[PDB]
């Protein structure tokens, strides 16, 4: 040909993407999706993965709708053991893990699991990874840090669409909150940024933002 | 939808 | 503090960002945005960088309108030496550039340049690094090639707001052109996207995106 | 020098970075021993010892500044009862007293279940390699690097100095060569045998990109 | 090895990257005169000789197999009329000729007004090092290299070997070490001495950030 | 706007 | 000089 | 064997 291009073979996580699709019992595409995991929680110690893991099941109740029943079955068992059918974005694969809902930890919640009701569809592919960020910049009073931090959303407030940049074109004066996963932590955090294209420096933010493979939530070689 | 704790 | 990050300096580039604003002689902060410069043309012998240049002036008169005005002056001295007052997002400075329209030339128009009327103001910021690109993506069947290419937009369509990834929330099905520099030819071209989110493999387009100081169009270390 | 198309601006980069410092720990001395692999469901990881960011300086007040068997001594007399380890953050800069009990009870290697190295704190968190791409059937792919998750830490050695990556591989060009290698999922240290090979039929020796620098550090909390 | 949560995908990659080419040149060899600074309004820049992707490997139909004073020596012969130049690009890895007009008529160094230097083009392509971040007052910094925009693609030297640049900088830990470096904006190679400090005040010895890899070879545009 | 060639 | 990992 | 930049 004249392109100065070729095909080569690289390695990328199996949590891509689009190899699909479902193979969930009860069927339906949606969970649970686990973002921030509470220290010495039920939920950590049932072993729910943030970002990674989704609830599908629990005690062969399928949860392909965003109701009170995961809250009520919850309510219902309190202190006492419920199996959860898990699966993880990551390995792509369902797993079983038993959890006792209580009140009898030290912190917020049955499980201490924060969560949102979405589809795993690509879930590993919607994230924004950010990159530099400059002083008193509106990422860095919130929050955000270099390169240790990623975006997956979202906090909705809510209509239509609306992923990252596409969220940002809105709440240009007004506060705005974020889904923010840490590797180093390797749990999710809830951080309220404001926007202001006119803060003194680069983009609305002051941080940079990056899209990809090259950009996604670290992977082990190794389930 | 939007985030909560269980 | 409590913080695990401290402030450090680093250099970027001046053409940032936000240390501003106008000294353009006539008011205003829009003129027309140098794309696409055609080899062996006025525009090229008259020295007009892509994507940096920005025509303000032509003979003395003020271009702060998209209107048929920078046409017929070069339509009036056609094959006749106009001089330009030009702004670069690079330098932050002005200056004057002599240019003969003609048809004399083997090439379409008569300074032979594709323009569009926008603002200067931190266009060097709105620019999108493609990162990876898949085989057979949409991004890579369209033209896209990875690192060497940047998308600066737009191609509008139009109405409302619109910029990258806010764009591709629309022609979900439907064809897309864009505006993409790349840093070898330096130079702007335009290609035909057209965005598939199941097209089978990451995103919509297949590639991966950079914004941010470590993901700008690169610039020489003096003037 | 004319007029600079660049200027300074300020950006976050994390506190372990970029500064002269021996440190202030008690006893002096400006080496420990490197808390590398720390097995699950091990007394080390009971004690909170985190791979890579955690250095032992001392045990129950003595100073461990000499490659030797005290550490293991004090361990082996100590066993099934606490002990008290000074460790140092290079994540933090600070000093922490952790307590720990070696067991001989748990299955698992060693007494506290963690691969450890002695060295210098010094900049540590510096001396990291960020493994970039990893094209297929490389020697990179083969050995278990893994795109973007790895980063090199170091390399288990010949007697090759400096060794920084780079002057490691093509000294090693014929057989391998072993590598320290931290993943940022797993939170934790693995040893990967390579083989390099510079016509191994494609990029480099490895067939992996590599990343060194503040966009390249291994990741940190915003705060201790 | 268990489930490898990792698998192959198809990517778009640069021709002139990750094969074995010994190249189809006439005349033999794999040598040539790799075109590094061209001068502005030069007989090289008339020519089209792009820095870096071009090397020189004949000139008139004599091969230049060796590092002689063959072409200087031919170029004076024929200044000020035509000379034909075969010329292989490492972008394109195709060989095509130019015709050039060496001459002493210009205001500027040489006959050609090129810097050129005689090395291999297997791979050449693979040989650089892209400077990512820079910090103030780093070494990098006031020797001249700038963020993103400047290509480390080897360095003029001592007989230090191999020269990666990694192993130049605690080596050359005194004073300089001069570098070559390409900057994309200019397309264009320039010399860069600088003097390594590891303990300058900051981040490595140099004080930026390297890049290597497909993710930071110097940029190819998209056809021939 | 749009983009057009001078 | 140079030491090597162990286990403790 | 390392030979060195000159002009042309």
């Known amino acids: 040909s004249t392109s100065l291009y070729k095909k080569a073979g690289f390695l990328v996580p199996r949590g891509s993407g689009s190899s699909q699709s479902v193979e969930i019992p009860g069927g ?5 999706h686990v973002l921030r995991v509470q220290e010495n929680s039920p939920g950590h110690r ?15 109740s399928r949860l392909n709708k965003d109701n009170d029943t995961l809250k ?20 792509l694969e369902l797993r079983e893990a038993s959890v006792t809902p209580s009140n009898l930890w ?3 919640g049955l499980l201490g699991v924060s969560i949102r009701f979405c589809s795993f569809d690509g879930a590993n592919e919607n994230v924004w990874h950010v990159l530099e960020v400059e002083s008193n910049s509106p990422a860095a ?7 240790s931090d990623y975006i997956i959303g979202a906090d909705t407030v809510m209509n239509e669409s609306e992923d990252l940049f596409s969220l940002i074109e809105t709440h240009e ?12 932590t390797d749990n999710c955090r809830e951080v ?14 002051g941080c940079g933002i990056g899209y990809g493979y ?8 190794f389930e | 939808t939007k985030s909560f704790i269980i």
Chains 1, 3 share one sequence.
Not at chain 1, 192 to 205: D, H, K, M, V
Not at chain 1, 214 to 221: D, E, F
Request: aromatic content about 10%; charged content about 20%; cysteine-free.
């Open chain 1, 106 to 108: 030290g912190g917020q």
């Open chain 1, 141 to 147: 009073l919130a929050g955000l840090r270099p390169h």
């Open chain 1, 46 to 60: 049932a072993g729910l993965e943030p970002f990674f893991d989704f609830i599908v099941s629990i005690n062969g």
């Open chain 1, 192 to 205: 309220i940024i404001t926007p202001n294209s006119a803060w003194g420096g680069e983009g609305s933010l």
């Open chain 1, 173 to 184: 004066a007004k506060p705005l909150k974020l889904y923010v996963y840490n590797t180093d």
């Open chain 1, 28 to 32: 339906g595409t949606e969970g649970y």
């Open chain 1, 214 to 221: 090259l950009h996604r939530i670290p992977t082990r070689p």
């Open chain 1, 72 to 91: 009520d079955l919850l309510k219902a068992n309190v202190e006492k053991p419920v199996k959860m059918l898990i699966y993880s974005s990551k390995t």
